[PDB]
Amino acid sequence: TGQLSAEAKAKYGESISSFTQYSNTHQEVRGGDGAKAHGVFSGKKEDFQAW
């Protein structure tokens, strides 16, 4: 007559996340007038038409 119980438990967790985003854009316009030329950078047709 003797009783013994023993338990050991271990849990481990590791989690790693990484995100990276990079953008580059370059636009150039020649001719017309420079003020309307800047308008094409909107990408909007009416402003492209105005240039």
Binding site: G13, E14, F19, Q27, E28
Partner: protein, 50 residues
């Protein structure tokens, strides 16, 4: 004075975005029992780290 037309435009855009994430978890548990006809013993230990 000589003036020349030069109507021109240039645009540049550079952008960078970054996320980094690290996570850790640790859990531990211990349970012990002792027995004798006129004695009983119990021990518990629990540990958690985040």
């Amino acid at each position: 004075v000589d003036v020349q037309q030069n109507d021109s435009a240039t645009y540049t855009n550079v952008s960078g975005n970054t996320i980094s994430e690290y996570q850790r978890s640790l859990a531990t548990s211990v349970a012990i029992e002792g027995r004798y006809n006129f004695f009983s013993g119990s021990l518990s230990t629990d540990f958690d780290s985040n």
